[PDB]
Amino acid sequence: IVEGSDAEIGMSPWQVMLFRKSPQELLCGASLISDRWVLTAAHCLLYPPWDKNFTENDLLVRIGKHSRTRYERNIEKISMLEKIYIHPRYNWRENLDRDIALMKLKKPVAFSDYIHPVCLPDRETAASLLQAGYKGRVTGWGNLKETGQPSVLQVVNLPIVERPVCKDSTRIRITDNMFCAGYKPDEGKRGDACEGDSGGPFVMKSPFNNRWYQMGIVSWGEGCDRDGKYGFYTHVFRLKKWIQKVIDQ
Amino acid sequence: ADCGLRPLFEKKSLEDKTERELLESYI
Amino acid sequence: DFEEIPEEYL
Numbered sequence: 001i002v003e004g005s006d007a008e009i010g011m012s013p014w015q016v017m018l019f020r021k022s023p024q025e026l027l028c029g030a031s032l033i034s035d036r037w038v039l040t041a042a043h044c045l046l047y048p049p050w051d052k053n054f055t056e057n058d059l060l061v062r063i064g065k066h067s068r069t070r071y072e073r074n075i076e077k078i079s080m081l082e083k084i085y086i087h088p089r090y091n092w093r094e095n096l097d098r099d100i101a102l103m104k105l106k107k108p109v110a111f112s113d114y115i116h117p118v119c120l121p122d123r124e125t126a127a128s129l130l131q132a133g134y135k136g137r138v139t140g141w142g143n144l145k146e147t148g149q150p151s152v153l154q155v156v157n158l159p160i161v162e163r164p165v166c167k168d169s170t171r172i173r174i175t176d177n178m179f180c181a182g183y184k185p186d187e188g189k190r191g192d193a194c195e196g197d198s199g200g201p202f203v204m205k206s207p208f209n210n211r212w213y214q215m216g217i218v219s220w221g222e223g224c225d226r227d228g229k230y231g232f233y234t235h236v237f238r239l240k241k242w243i244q245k246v247i248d249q
Numbered sequence: 250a251d252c253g254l255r256p257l258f259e260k261k262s263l264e265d266k267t268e269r270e271l272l273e274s275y276i
Numbered sequence: 277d278f279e280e281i282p283e284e285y286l
């Protein structure tokens with residue numbers, strides 16, 4: 001996260017760290033959607049341009065974390081993966097269309113003050129919250145700058161940007177399965193997700209029922225926090241039918 | 250279910266430092 | 277720079 005702030009304790013209890021076993025490093029962000037299901041970006045697990053093709057046994061999910069590097073004894077819970085499910089129409093060749101993946105945990109995770117799942121939106125929550133100017137929140141342990149790393153989880157609030165403005169900021173073709181967020185150069189305020197934030201959640205707090213919903217997944221951008229550029233997110237509600245199908249099994 | 254309600258915030262009726270910025274944006 | 281994690285997690 002570039003131009004964010006340290007998260008408060010228990011501020012994002014659905015935050016998941018995707019951790020590579022060997023070498024021991026941060027792979028991606030992710031999110032807790034139930035006691036056994038974790039949501040992430042498909043490119044965190046499969047990205048042929050960079051020779052990325054992780055299997056279940058190559059990683060661990062670390063839940064309830066605040067510190068990036070330390071082992072949070074009595075706080076975080078580390079889980080092993082039973083199965084990875086990548087969207088069958090995930091487009092890694094061009095624009096990361098349908099950049100979404102589900103991960104089934106071997107054992108259910110126990111909820112605590114630091115571990116709690118985020119909601120997934122219904123058609124109405126999505127229609128009412130996914131509006132240009134409405135702010136969401138992005139969290140992660142990614143790069144603090146484009147060209148270092150935070151000690152603790154970082155947070156940034158960012159407004160959803162109008163579809164024409166997103167499309168006009170880039171040469172990449174944008175689909176209905178993505179949305180962009182961030183401030184314009186004129187707005188004053190700054191902020192963006194960056195490398196290592198991928199797979200993390202873009203959340204919004206419903207003013208109707210006061211619950212947090214995951215509206216986006218950190219997907220891509222061109223650099224980080226560049227003027228006239230915006231971060232792109234997987235549109236979760238557009239792919240909820242695939243999510244439901246995999247969970248229903 | 251109890252999704253999206255944080256034990257240290259909504260469950261305690263405590264607000265985090267910036268959530269009001271999100272609410273104020275929902276015009 | 278990542279602190280070691282208990283052996284039980286492989």
Ligand SMILES: N=C(N)c1ccc(CNC(=O)[C@@H]2CCN2C(=O)[C@H](NCC(N)=O)C2CCCCC2)cc1
Binds near residue numbers: 095225
């Ligand atoms: N600024 C952001 N919001 C932001 C930027 C980057 C990331 C990390 N995600 C990735 O690296 C994924 C795999 C390919 N990719 C990219 O972002 C590429 N840029 C790579 C790059 N360094 O800009 C991006 C270039 C345009 C075509 C789609 C892929 C997450 C968030």
Ligand SMILES: *[C@@H]1O[C@H](CO)[C@@H](O[C@@H]2O[C@H](CO)[C@@H](O)[C@H](O)[C@H]2NC(C)=O)[C@H](O)[C@H]1NC(C)=O
Binds near residue numbers: 046048053055
């Ligand atoms: C990514 O890695 C997987 C292995 O984990 C590859 O899957 C194999 O695919 C071949 C045919 O393409 C099958 O006959 C094997 O049985 C597969 N193994 C498993 C475990 O699924 C996959 O092709 C790799 N590359 C891409 C781009 O997906």
Ligand code: NA
Binds near residue numbers: 168169
């Ligand atoms: Na364009």
Ligand code: NA
Binds near residue numbers: 182192225227228229
């Ligand atoms: Na920008």
